[PDB]
Amino acid sequence: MITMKCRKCGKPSIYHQKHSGNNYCKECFIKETKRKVRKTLGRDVLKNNIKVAMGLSGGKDSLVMAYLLNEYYKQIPNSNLIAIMVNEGIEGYRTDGIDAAVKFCEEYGIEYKIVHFKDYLGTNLDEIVTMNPCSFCGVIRRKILNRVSIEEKCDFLAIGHNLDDVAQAVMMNYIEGDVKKLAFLGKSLKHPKFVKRIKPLEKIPEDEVLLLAEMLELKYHKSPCPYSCLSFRSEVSDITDNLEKNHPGSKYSIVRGYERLLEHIEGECKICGGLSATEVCKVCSYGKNLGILEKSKF
Amino acid sequence: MITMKCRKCGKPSIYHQKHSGNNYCKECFIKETKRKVRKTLGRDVLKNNIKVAMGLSGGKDSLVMAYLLNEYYKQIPNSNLIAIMVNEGIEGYRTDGIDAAVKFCEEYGIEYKIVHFKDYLGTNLDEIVKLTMNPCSFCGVIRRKILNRVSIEEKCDFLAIGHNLDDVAQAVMMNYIEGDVKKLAFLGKSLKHPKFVKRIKPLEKIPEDEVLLLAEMLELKYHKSPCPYSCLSFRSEVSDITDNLEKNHPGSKYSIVRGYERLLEHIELECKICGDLSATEVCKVCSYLKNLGILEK
Ligand code: SF4
Ligand code: SF4
Ligand SMILES: [Zn+2]
Ligand SMILES: [Zn+2]
Ligand SMILES: [Zn+2]
Ligand SMILES: [Zn+2]
């Protein structure tokens, strides 16, 4: 009686979903991942007369998200999909990673747009003499992607964050005790054409994203950062992993717990563009330390 | 340059506070622990014309908290301190635990009151017949209601509980991992309590290691008090998470707690025969009180 046949077709299985206790072959795993992503996005995102910008970085996540989104919008006529790669401009890596994303876009017919850090910002790599490097990079990338999505007049900005990436970030915000970082995430419903950040992979674990990348034979590139290595996220990932390894569905209950939390919690800027308040811009804080550069509003 | 002299007096040290990177001798550590507890309680708790009931269970925490509170209220003329021991009646050796707590109350002159679970309707002489849920949860929930009803009976202003920084960081993390917002809703709302006696935790910001070190220096005769009918492995797993986080990032337990304190201040704000209620449906928090036990007027 206790075998390993597929839950949907009773055929030999390739994946045992440790959370649910369900076995899935190649075909049934792809179908249930597509179903879960279709559920995550909803009918507001998956419909006609919709333009979706997507932040691609060459890794498994971006390419897996890019492939799934393309499969849906391929069978929708007036529903465009644009790919944005943001070249940080490092002497070490970054050059490799975007190459795998560009070659994917060519092979699958996705309109790509490579935008550089050394364009919107004057300095390509490091503001050496003081201030956090990995954070600075992520904050700017978000503002660049928002500005490119507005420029291309996109309805949504798709980001390849998986359930592990979200569970880690939630747990990090919990361990750090950040309520100010939790506050900025609060006002993210619908704002002045401020392109809505969608995460199609938000409920798919890293292992499933990786397994889906292997089965689709997607030529993804890891691209390790030569100027940033935060050991806290790798420590937090081990916490969430060991929690999942002892209690299946921990990562989901951690995330669902933050989703419920964010519901029950209660353009302003200078020169550039609105994000929260005028005061002294959080992005232009590092800009003030050097000198303000091109690309701004009226 | 790099020695080990005391941060407050420059004398050889007995404790290295791994989170602050500071060193304290016996006298300076006792003084900084007393200062932190004085800070946790405030002027409203540490003043004249108040009575403080305190849940004692015989362990280092309850005795350390009982000793500190007694030191303060000893010099305060019009302020009282009552100790309440709750024998759950769940057989085994709970008696040896209360024995250490009673013998402290005798040696230090604190008015003690031993109250039973069986005395407040039911039995619980191992009642679960064939902290998270079912046996361990039901015990903790009742204990709270018994302690509240003994404090009301003695007309106390506050109910002191021996929860330490480790105890508090773990519970917060458990509530985070479980994703409980309904259990988070119970905390707060009832901030303007009518009949409910205010639950104070003097040890709330003192880590378990400091509480234990303070117990050793004061030569307190505390009892181990182990449970023969409850062992929840999740809290022991969570404690290891909070410990390994502290061991790699000093002050993690405090930032986890301070993060929950800041969260609870910016968050969203029928029980027949007994009472409690306060924006809650059916038995409020009373696990059952129906069929298996009943017994009502
Ligand atoms: S790891 Fe590198 S590319 Fe990623 S946010 Fe940090 S600095 Fe930027
Ligand atoms: S460990 Fe034992 S005494 Fe403590 S709450 Fe659980 S059942 Fe009650
Ligand atoms: Zn199948
Ligand atoms: Zn700005
Ligand atoms: Zn000293
Ligand atoms: Zn009741």
Residue numbers in the entry:
A (entry chain B): 1 to 129, 138 to 274, 280 to 311
B (entry chain A): 1 to 130, 137 to 275, 281 to 308
List sentences quoted exactly from the publication behind this structure:
Thiolation of uridine 34 in the anticodon loop of several tRNAs is conserved in the three domains of life and guarantees fidelity of protein translation. We report here spectroscopic and biochemical experiments showing that NcsA from Methanococcus maripaludis (MmNcsA) is a dimer that binds a [4Fe-4S] cluster, which is required for catalysis.
The crystals belong to space group P212121 and contain two molecules in the asymmetric unit that form a dimer. The [4Fe-4S] cluster is chelated by three conserved cysteines only: Cys142, Cys145, and Cys233. Remarkably, while three Fe atoms are attached to the protein via these 3 cysteines, the fourth iron completes its coordination with a non-protein, exogenous ligand, as revealed by an electron density adjacent to that Fe atom. Based on the diffraction data at only one wavelength, it is not possible to distinguish between a water molecule, a hydrogenosulfide ion, a chloride ion or the oxygen atom of a sulfate molecule, which all could be refined with B-factors in the same range as those for the protein. A negatively charged ligand on the fourth iron atom is very likely, given its charge complementary with the [4Fe-4S]2+ cluster and its proximity with the guanidinium group of Arg149, located less than 3 Å away. Superposition of the MmNcsA and PhTtuA catalytic cores shows that the two proteins adopt the same fold but highlights different orientations of the terminal zinc-containing domains relative to the catalytic core. Moreover, Lys135 in PhTtuA is replaced, in MmNcsA, by Arg149 that adopts two different conformations. In both molecules of the asymmetric unit, two loops (residues 130–137 and 275–280), for which there was no electron density, were not modelled. The propensity of the fourth non protein-bonded iron to bind a small molecule indicates that the [4Fe-4S] cluster likely plays a direct role as a Lewis acid in catalysis, specifically to bind, activate a HS− species and transfer it to the activated substrate, as proposed earlier for TtuA39.
